Design a protein around this ligand. Structure first.
Ligand SMILES: CC(=O)N[C@@H](Cc1ccccc1Cl)C(=O)N1CCC[C@]12C=C[C@@H]1CC[C@@H](C(=O)N3CC[C@@H]4C=C[C@H]5C=C[C@@H](C(=O)O)N5C(=O)[C@H]43)N1C2=O
Ligand SMILES: [Br-]
Ligand SMILES: [Br-]
Length: 110
């Protein structure tokens, strides 16, 4: 089965490569509950975020082994895939540190 190993509150953003700016994931700005989930068997992790107001899934992306997770500032962290760059604007330094730590520890289990 699948298990949430950590969660944190963050405004989830994606980078608009064409206009050089960050835009809100899913179309509207606001905080989401962002989880890292582990699936047993094939030992995979994914980031899944749902907007707190309406449960819209704003991010659902795989965490591949060797993913480069960038702590750009104390409360904005980011990573990429082929299609998009994702950014989490955390509610506090503490939320960020919790999430970052779970991510770094996931990358060691992969
Ligand atoms: C090599 C590479 O991919 N580099 C990436 C970052 C990264 C490094 C390691 C691993 C993964 C990633 Cl995504 C990179 O530099 N990127 C990807 C998106 C666009 C950007 C490339 C150039 C620009 C320059 C400034 C920086 C950026 O986007 N920043 C810096 C921190 C700041 C913090 C928050 C967001 C929120 C709104 C916007 C703003 O402040 O107006 N922000 C920014 O402007 C953010 N940029 C980036 O982060
Ligand atoms: Br829970
Ligand atoms: Br496993």
């Amino acid at each position: 089965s699948e298990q949430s190993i950590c969660q944190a509150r963050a405004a989830v953003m994606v980078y608009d490569d064409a206009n050089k700016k960050w835009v809100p994931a899913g179309g509207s700005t606001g905080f989401s509950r962002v989880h890292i989930y582990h699936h047993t068997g094939n030992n995979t992790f994914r980031v899944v975020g749902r907007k707190i107001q309406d449960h819209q899934v704003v991010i659902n992306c795989a965490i591949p082994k060797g993913l480069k997770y960038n702590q750009a500032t104390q409360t904005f962290h980011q990573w990429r895939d082929a299609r998009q760059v994702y950014g989490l604007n955390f509610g506090s330094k503490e939320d960020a540190n919790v999430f970052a730590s779970a991510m770094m520890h996931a990358l060691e289990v992969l």
